[PDB]
């Protein structure tokens, strides 16, 4: 298990009660404890799953993310202050880190501690042996669900490669003097192999926290680290679905016709695509049992609901987003019936789907990308949202996050583009762009049409179809696809006139053009401009 002398080596003192490798049954009674107060509390829903509140923090806090700049990360990290693109990798001094470590370790000292040992990465050769230390039971549950649960033999000789101490209950009083964003903090020290959290309870910080570390370590060894969903067909054909938050990675990869490899984080080495996690983190806002049966069915004992509204009788109102629109539910991957096992990996991907939810209603439901359009759109990392739908009218807000996940990038986005291209070319992979977002109808395309589109991409129908070039973006779109409504296939059809579509295509194109300018500092990046939209 674990001794108090080892926890002391970390800096945590007077730990009397230690719960090493808590079981799901223990975690279950821990959360349901009637004498719990505030955010540690869990309630039982009629679906058998416990629901908790993550507190004030209902999403990640990129503004509070810091990485210690020392001789190990100085020349390798994609620093937010080196003027090479917008990122959240703000530098932190070794000195301020020690103060933060003091805060967290002291907060955890003299407390009952949960110690969850787990792996990040399905392969023994590149995975991280992470030890999570926390004082909140549902947080230990979150990481038991989301990371790879070792076997008794792996636990026997478990030597941690990284430690993440969650001091969510403590805050940083010296922040103003230290030049930080607030009293909260999500800091990382690559020299000490540690992550510290304070102020925010949100479990997503640990998840995306180790992802950022994999995003740093893997590409440096020639392995692609990707923000993508992934599944395999019965033939052995692997597909990866890149995309920003809310685009459909989890919704679409969870298809009964294919075996789920993972839903959010994967690597791509010499053998293929491997999952980093041990669970799935599904969105539950307006969740439909009919539209997403497999995900709904996964919600039961051992799944951990978050911020959803639970009525008196224990029933859940999934449509209620008053606490947050980011309602979620984590669960072990095995809660999905059709998955790859025992190990969550498979062969090289041949299909690479870039999902995007276009609030502008410009991009087409699907288009097969050229080799250059693939790189252009990868570095672009576009998606948009109807910000203000609650305050009035549409007003689409664009988001350009490099590699479809800049918030977790620890190296320059070109380092991810390169390793990805090297993997795609060796496997002969093909890339597609899917607009899981909006049309001229002002509505989002149906999940039915979108799934029918994904089938077409995977079974080769999209490749065999006759296509024509959509103007502005110069995207090859099919004239028709099996199971998909033909009208929506061409975005101009959903408007009163193609001129109305044109107006928007022009606005969105300038957004893309302005955003891509920062990559044209190299000859290769200058050449890709030809691949993007053109006025
Ligand atoms: N056509 C569509 N394709 C995918 N998701 C859709 C579609 N229409 C609506 N949605 C909703 O959009 C969200 C996509 O979420 P999810 O797959 O969890 O995003 P990601 O995993 O990329 O964050 C879900 O709430 C889903 O029900
Ligand atoms: Mg997801």
XYZ file of C-alpha atoms and ligand atoms in Angstrom:
563
model
C 0.000 0.000 0.000
C 1.491 3.265 1.241
C 3.214 4.414 4.454
C 3.095 7.811 6.251
C 6.881 8.072 5.858
C 6.549 8.063 2.062
C 3.850 10.734 2.133
C 6.259 12.702 4.314
C 8.898 12.527 1.591
C 6.396 14.493 -0.516
C 6.059 17.024 2.297
C 2.729 15.917 3.783
C 2.878 15.505 7.558
C 0.750 13.987 10.329
C -1.301 11.825 7.991
C -3.101 9.430 10.313
C -5.745 7.949 8.013
C -4.656 6.828 4.547
C -6.963 5.235 1.999
C -4.656 3.758 -0.629
C -6.241 2.492 -3.866
C -9.862 3.030 -2.730
C -12.418 0.601 -4.127
C -15.561 1.740 -5.954
C -17.671 0.449 -3.059
C -15.702 2.507 -0.565
C -15.853 5.612 -2.797
C -19.576 4.997 -3.050
C -20.183 5.091 0.743
C -17.703 7.962 1.168
C -19.735 10.222 -1.138
C -23.072 9.175 0.346
C -21.950 9.887 3.972
C -24.825 11.883 5.630
C -22.376 13.894 7.741
C -20.605 15.440 4.736
C -20.833 19.199 4.128
C -20.697 21.333 1.006
C -18.963 20.227 -2.169
C -17.732 16.907 -0.810
C -21.361 15.785 -0.639
C -22.859 13.358 -3.078
C -26.471 12.384 -3.648
C -27.803 9.185 -5.159
C -29.734 9.518 -8.423
C -32.461 7.090 -9.565
C -29.992 5.779 -12.170
C -27.792 4.395 -9.378
C -25.017 6.903 -9.916
C -23.862 9.447 -7.361
C -23.999 13.140 -8.349
C -21.713 15.825 -6.865
C -21.080 19.555 -7.276
C -17.556 20.568 -8.335
C -17.995 23.899 -6.581
C -17.429 27.422 -7.798
C -15.195 26.006 -10.508
C -17.419 24.303 -13.001
C -14.843 24.161 -15.787
C -11.086 24.470 -16.161
C -9.311 27.687 -15.271
C -6.725 28.321 -18.027
C -5.939 31.733 -16.488
C -4.563 29.995 -13.398
C -2.310 27.535 -15.225
C 1.453 27.902 -14.644
C 4.527 25.845 -15.493
C 7.827 26.274 -13.656
C 10.432 27.759 -16.020
C 13.772 26.183 -15.204
C 16.697 24.645 -17.088
C 14.575 21.636 -18.052
C 11.617 23.518 -19.567
C 13.270 26.795 -20.586
C 14.190 25.902 -24.165
C 11.535 23.249 -24.788
C 8.218 24.642 -23.575
C 5.776 26.656 -25.646
C 5.891 29.643 -23.274
C 3.048 32.123 -23.223
C 5.506 35.005 -22.940
C 7.997 34.089 -25.682
C 5.673 35.716 -28.229
C 5.160 32.610 -30.373
C 1.373 32.320 -30.338
C -1.321 32.618 -27.680
C -1.193 29.947 -24.975
C -1.784 29.428 -21.251
C 1.700 28.120 -20.404
C 2.562 31.082 -18.160
C 6.026 30.843 -16.570
C 6.426 30.288 -12.814
C 9.576 30.766 -10.706
C 11.019 27.816 -8.776
C 10.577 29.998 -5.652
C 6.859 30.675 -6.019
C 6.330 26.982 -6.802
C 7.822 26.073 -3.420
C 5.368 28.444 -1.753
C 2.461 26.755 -3.598
C 3.813 23.327 -2.665
C 3.902 24.581 0.920
C 0.253 25.573 0.682
C -0.953 22.248 -0.747
C 1.166 19.892 1.360
C 0.152 21.757 4.576
C -3.541 21.603 3.592
C -3.270 17.839 3.065
C -1.248 17.357 6.271
C -3.172 16.083 9.284
C -6.048 15.060 6.995
C -7.497 11.725 5.927
C -5.873 11.156 2.533
C -6.894 9.134 -0.539
C -4.005 7.861 -2.678
C -4.892 6.645 -6.162
C -2.088 5.104 -8.223
C -2.869 5.013 -11.944
C -1.357 5.094 -15.449
C -1.674 7.731 -18.173
C -1.137 5.920 -21.475
C -2.103 2.341 -22.400
C 1.441 1.252 -23.326
C 3.997 0.287 -20.637
C 6.846 1.920 -22.562
C 5.457 5.486 -22.687
C 2.870 5.667 -19.878
C 3.227 7.758 -16.730
C 2.898 6.155 -13.285
C 0.906 8.883 -11.587
C 0.072 9.000 -7.865
C -2.913 11.216 -7.069
C -3.254 12.512 -3.508
C -6.513 14.100 -2.403
C -8.778 14.701 0.604
C -12.087 14.642 -1.268
C -13.520 11.191 -2.084
C -15.299 12.111 -5.321
C -12.023 13.554 -6.647
C -10.292 10.228 -6.068
C -13.299 8.635 -7.789
C -12.891 10.962 -10.783
C -9.283 9.821 -11.272
C -10.149 6.152 -10.676
C -12.688 6.522 -13.498
C -10.510 8.612 -15.861
C -7.064 7.082 -15.645
C -5.843 3.532 -16.225
C -6.529 1.366 -13.156
C -3.466 -0.847 -12.536
C -3.604 -4.560 -11.796
C -2.488 -6.003 -8.447
C 0.898 -6.862 -9.981
C 1.346 -3.365 -11.389
C 0.380 -1.914 -7.996
C 2.919 -4.169 -6.277
C 5.927 -2.583 -7.963
C 4.384 0.842 -8.660
C 7.036 3.578 -8.780
C 5.456 7.031 -9.423
C 6.756 9.073 -12.398
C 4.520 12.001 -11.580
C 2.586 13.188 -8.520
C -0.523 15.333 -8.513
C -1.502 16.775 -5.137
C -4.964 18.247 -5.036
C -5.207 21.020 -2.456
C -8.550 22.334 -3.755
C -9.515 23.478 -0.260
C -6.507 25.774 0.119
C -5.941 29.113 -1.615
C -2.918 31.327 -2.301
C -2.906 34.531 -0.172
C 0.353 35.804 -1.714
C -0.852 35.843 -5.328
C -0.871 39.630 -5.904
C 2.734 39.930 -4.710
C 3.690 36.871 -6.789
C 2.137 38.177 -10.023
C -0.444 35.418 -10.466
C -4.005 35.592 -11.792
C -5.741 34.757 -8.514
C -5.557 32.763 -5.265
C -6.305 29.622 -7.280
C -3.533 27.708 -9.064
C -2.844 24.739 -11.358
C 0.928 24.648 -11.516
C 3.350 22.116 -12.994
C 6.980 21.364 -12.236
C 8.728 19.105 -14.761
C 11.899 19.064 -12.685
C 10.046 17.714 -9.632
C 7.476 15.813 -11.749
C 4.504 17.278 -9.927
C 1.194 19.071 -10.400
C -0.396 21.205 -7.660
C -3.989 22.386 -7.510
C -5.519 24.941 -5.151
C -8.832 26.754 -4.986
C -10.532 24.799 -7.776
C -12.231 21.463 -7.101
C -12.820 20.644 -10.801
C -11.399 17.203 -11.528
C -10.846 18.143 -15.179
C -7.693 19.923 -14.027
C -5.988 16.612 -13.174
C -7.224 14.913 -16.377
C -6.161 17.686 -18.729
C -3.185 18.237 -16.447
C -1.531 14.896 -17.197
C -2.669 15.195 -20.838
C -0.557 18.391 -21.077
C 2.368 16.401 -19.689
C 1.849 13.660 -22.290
C 1.523 16.460 -24.869
C 4.989 17.534 -23.783
C 6.771 14.187 -23.438
C 5.472 12.154 -26.382
C 6.194 14.422 -29.405
C 9.752 14.871 -28.082
C 10.115 11.087 -28.592
C 8.470 11.058 -32.036
C 5.032 9.981 -30.797
C 1.935 11.996 -31.698
C -0.019 13.096 -28.633
C -3.530 13.931 -29.769
C -6.673 15.609 -28.475
C -8.941 13.091 -30.132
C -11.606 10.456 -29.821
C -10.966 7.053 -31.453
C -12.599 3.772 -32.474
C -11.907 0.684 -34.564
C -13.978 -1.298 -37.056
C -14.238 -5.092 -37.133
C -11.734 -5.104 -40.012
C -9.093 -3.313 -37.979
C -9.580 0.102 -39.551
C -8.856 2.851 -37.033
C -10.378 6.318 -37.054
C -9.512 9.349 -34.898
C -11.856 12.297 -34.389
C -10.093 15.581 -33.498
C -12.103 18.521 -32.223
C -12.544 21.242 -29.653
C -14.907 21.015 -26.683
C -18.513 20.264 -27.607
C -17.757 19.249 -31.212
C -18.685 15.571 -30.917
C -15.594 13.498 -30.106
C -17.382 11.559 -27.356
C -20.832 11.555 -28.969
C -19.643 10.308 -32.336
C -16.872 7.832 -31.426
C -19.360 6.031 -29.185
C -20.892 4.131 -32.073
C -22.215 0.563 -31.534
C -20.912 -0.487 -34.979
C -17.329 0.103 -33.829
C -15.158 -0.734 -30.823
C -14.338 2.313 -28.671
C -10.611 2.816 -28.157
C -10.921 6.067 -26.213
C -12.872 9.309 -26.203
C -10.458 12.185 -25.659
C -6.700 11.577 -25.431
C -4.548 9.291 -27.578
C -0.985 8.799 -28.707
C 0.246 7.460 -32.047
C 3.529 5.590 -32.015
C 5.250 3.017 -34.252
C 2.492 0.479 -33.521
C -0.589 2.640 -33.677
C -3.147 4.670 -31.772
C -3.251 4.153 -27.997
C -5.611 5.595 -25.391
C -4.147 7.563 -22.474
C -7.203 7.170 -20.233
C -9.268 4.584 -18.394
C -12.640 6.232 -18.796
C -14.895 8.615 -20.689
C -16.014 12.089 -19.652
C -19.385 12.678 -21.291
C -21.405 15.845 -21.505
C -24.869 15.497 -20.010
C -26.516 18.807 -20.893
C -29.845 17.942 -22.504
C -28.690 14.310 -22.711
C -31.071 12.076 -24.648
C -31.449 8.370 -23.897
C -32.813 7.912 -27.430
C -30.104 9.910 -29.233
C -27.254 8.709 -27.001
C -28.375 5.340 -25.511
C -24.882 3.932 -24.929
C -23.767 7.027 -23.020
C -27.035 7.182 -21.075
C -26.784 3.479 -20.242
C -23.278 4.059 -18.905
C -24.738 6.293 -16.169
C -25.202 3.973 -13.192
C -23.317 2.929 -10.060
C -19.609 3.854 -10.385
C -20.283 6.661 -12.876
C -19.832 10.076 -11.254
C -22.341 12.766 -12.233
C -21.310 16.437 -11.934
C -23.280 19.654 -11.473
C -26.497 18.200 -12.882
C -29.757 19.069 -11.153
C -31.140 16.188 -9.112
C -34.782 16.582 -8.115
C -36.296 15.532 -4.774
C -37.304 12.033 -5.902
C -33.753 11.459 -7.150
C -34.536 11.883 -10.866
C -32.185 13.976 -12.982
C -33.115 17.010 -15.067
C -30.381 16.770 -17.699
C -31.747 19.825 -19.534
C -31.145 22.035 -16.473
C -27.938 23.963 -17.072
C -28.504 26.680 -14.460
C -25.480 25.578 -12.400
C -23.505 25.093 -15.601
C -23.865 24.098 -19.216
C -20.756 21.951 -18.636
C -22.661 19.239 -16.769
C -20.774 15.935 -17.075
C -20.517 12.280 -16.119
C -17.292 10.313 -15.855
C -17.310 6.506 -15.952
C -14.886 3.666 -16.525
C -14.516 2.860 -20.236
C -16.000 -0.607 -19.637
C -19.393 1.044 -18.973
C -19.565 1.162 -22.783
C -20.374 -2.334 -24.052
C -18.497 -2.325 -27.353
C -14.901 -1.339 -26.585
C -11.403 -2.562 -27.285
C -9.944 -4.601 -24.429
C -8.003 -5.615 -22.431
C -5.748 -2.798 -23.665
C -7.247 0.353 -25.203
C -5.232 0.538 -28.427
C -5.355 -0.623 -32.048
C -3.573 -0.130 -35.369
C -2.604 2.947 -37.357
C -5.473 5.259 -38.208
C -6.546 5.441 -41.857
C -9.380 7.937 -41.285
C -8.727 11.266 -39.507
C -11.881 13.256 -38.841
C -11.629 16.931 -37.795
C -14.903 17.812 -36.080
C -16.002 21.451 -35.781
C -19.231 23.148 -34.696
C -19.557 26.154 -36.975
C -21.766 28.804 -35.339
C -21.422 30.859 -38.532
C -23.375 28.268 -40.535
C -20.780 28.275 -43.317
C -18.766 25.046 -43.390
C -20.418 21.993 -45.002
C -21.557 18.860 -43.045
C -18.614 17.008 -44.589
C -15.798 17.460 -47.092
C -12.735 15.353 -47.829
C -9.562 17.377 -47.199
C -6.452 17.643 -49.369
C -3.037 17.016 -47.780
C -2.430 20.756 -47.480
C -5.978 21.583 -46.398
C -5.443 19.003 -43.634
C -2.397 20.774 -42.208
C -3.960 24.182 -42.700
C -7.081 23.224 -40.757
C -5.140 21.332 -38.099
C -3.036 24.363 -37.101
C -6.155 26.530 -37.449
C -8.159 24.581 -34.828
C -11.501 26.217 -35.555
C -14.900 26.006 -33.895
C -17.451 28.689 -33.007
C -20.348 29.137 -30.606
C -23.579 31.112 -30.402
C -22.417 33.181 -27.446
C -25.303 35.298 -26.237
C -28.090 32.860 -27.071
C -29.255 33.500 -23.500
C -28.646 37.277 -23.594
C -30.420 37.868 -26.899
C -29.387 36.944 -30.454
C -26.847 34.620 -32.165
C -23.613 36.619 -32.638
C -21.216 33.703 -33.465
C -17.963 33.724 -31.529
C -15.003 32.042 -33.224
C -12.334 30.021 -31.499
C -9.031 29.181 -33.142
C -7.219 26.643 -30.993
C -4.155 25.131 -32.705
C -4.241 21.336 -33.192
C -7.861 21.389 -32.000
C -6.582 21.652 -28.419
C -4.091 24.464 -27.794
C -5.090 24.655 -24.102
C -3.111 21.466 -23.492
C -0.220 22.033 -25.883
C 3.163 22.093 -24.150
C 5.207 22.353 -27.329
C 4.728 24.540 -30.421
C 1.681 23.537 -32.512
C 3.951 22.816 -35.485
C 5.645 20.046 -33.497
C 2.250 18.304 -33.273
C 1.408 18.967 -36.920
C 4.710 17.415 -38.007
C 4.507 14.168 -36.058
C 0.855 13.820 -37.096
C 1.658 14.236 -40.798
C 4.529 11.746 -40.471
C 2.100 9.209 -39.010
C -0.669 9.889 -41.545
C 1.663 9.569 -44.544
C 3.112 6.252 -43.367
C -0.408 4.802 -42.938
C -1.908 6.503 -45.969
C -4.499 8.173 -43.765
C -7.150 10.461 -45.226
C -8.520 13.564 -43.491
C -12.075 14.912 -43.502
C -13.747 18.018 -42.092
C -17.125 17.584 -40.422
C -19.340 20.479 -39.403
C -21.309 19.007 -36.502
C -22.463 22.580 -35.964
C -24.845 25.052 -37.567
C -26.591 25.607 -40.924
C -28.607 28.436 -42.448
C -31.511 27.026 -40.427
C -30.037 28.595 -37.314
C -30.178 25.059 -35.927
C -27.469 22.493 -35.381
C -27.409 19.562 -37.809
C -29.048 16.442 -36.366
C -26.972 13.751 -34.681
C -28.684 11.302 -37.077
C -27.335 13.007 -40.206
C -23.958 13.421 -38.552
C -23.703 9.748 -37.627
C -24.890 8.815 -41.146
C -22.060 11.054 -42.429
C -19.489 9.313 -40.199
C -20.646 5.896 -41.495
C -20.138 7.158 -45.085
C -16.613 8.362 -44.271
C -15.707 5.049 -42.651
C -17.250 2.591 -45.126
C -15.741 4.376 -48.122
C -18.988 5.864 -49.429
C -17.740 9.456 -49.117
C -14.609 8.509 -51.069
C -16.579 6.860 -53.902
C -19.093 9.712 -54.231
C -18.923 12.325 -56.967
C -17.950 15.677 -55.511
C -17.689 19.314 -56.526
C -15.807 22.230 -55.024
C -17.542 24.498 -52.526
C -16.271 28.063 -53.184
C -14.309 30.327 -50.786
C -13.045 27.393 -48.741
C -12.474 25.211 -51.830
C -13.801 22.109 -50.127
C -14.797 18.956 -51.985
C -18.348 18.100 -50.944
C -20.372 15.078 -52.127
C -23.420 15.445 -54.332
C -25.026 12.786 -52.166
C -24.426 10.263 -49.407
C -26.301 7.181 -48.146
C -28.593 7.945 -45.206
C -27.807 11.667 -45.273
C -30.270 14.350 -46.394
C -28.870 15.678 -49.689
C -30.137 19.227 -49.128
C -27.853 19.902 -46.156
C -24.775 18.464 -47.916
C -24.236 21.831 -49.620
C -24.378 24.669 -47.018
C -25.798 27.195 -49.511
C -29.051 25.237 -49.709
C -30.034 25.992 -46.098
C -30.147 29.752 -46.779
C -32.675 31.793 -48.772
C -29.941 32.351 -51.345
C -26.276 31.343 -51.829
C -25.530 35.066 -51.545
C -26.626 34.965 -47.905
C -24.272 32.051 -47.412
C -21.602 34.046 -49.258
C -21.792 36.958 -46.808
C -21.022 34.642 -43.923
C -18.374 32.669 -45.816
C -16.632 36.015 -46.397
C -16.748 37.010 -42.708
C -15.504 33.589 -41.541
C -12.799 33.471 -44.215
C -11.247 36.751 -43.014
C -11.258 35.316 -39.470
C -9.338 32.260 -40.699
C -6.964 34.356 -42.803
C -6.140 36.683 -39.910
C -5.621 33.779 -37.532
C -3.364 31.767 -39.834
C -0.973 34.668 -40.459
C 1.136 33.762 -37.412
C 2.120 30.415 -39.007
C 3.424 31.950 -42.247
C 6.749 32.805 -40.566
C 8.196 29.649 -42.152
C 8.358 28.747 -45.874
C 6.092 25.722 -45.312
C 3.532 27.776 -43.413
C 3.629 30.408 -46.152
C 2.757 27.734 -48.701
C -0.245 26.439 -46.746
C -1.986 29.796 -47.097
C -2.982 28.624 -50.593
C -4.856 25.770 -48.884
C -7.020 27.992 -46.708
C -10.142 29.972 -47.638
C -9.613 32.721 -50.229
C -11.544 35.940 -50.706
N -24.700 16.670 -34.922
C -24.134 16.556 -33.728
N -22.973 15.885 -33.596
C -22.410 15.776 -32.383
N -22.847 16.265 -31.222
C -24.030 16.927 -31.380
C -24.710 17.115 -32.560
N -25.869 17.845 -32.344
C -25.868 18.099 -31.061
N -24.782 17.577 -30.402
C -24.496 17.706 -28.954
O -23.226 18.338 -28.923
C -22.456 17.843 -27.837
C -21.205 17.178 -28.350
O -20.525 16.755 -27.180
P -19.324 15.765 -26.932
O -19.321 14.696 -27.933
O -19.314 15.460 -25.500
O -18.174 16.873 -27.294
P -16.638 16.564 -27.210
O -16.445 15.187 -26.746
O -16.005 16.922 -28.499
O -16.479 17.743 -26.131
C -23.335 16.827 -27.079
O -24.027 17.562 -26.033
C -24.289 16.398 -28.212
O -25.534 15.831 -27.747
Mg -15.587 14.505 -24.822
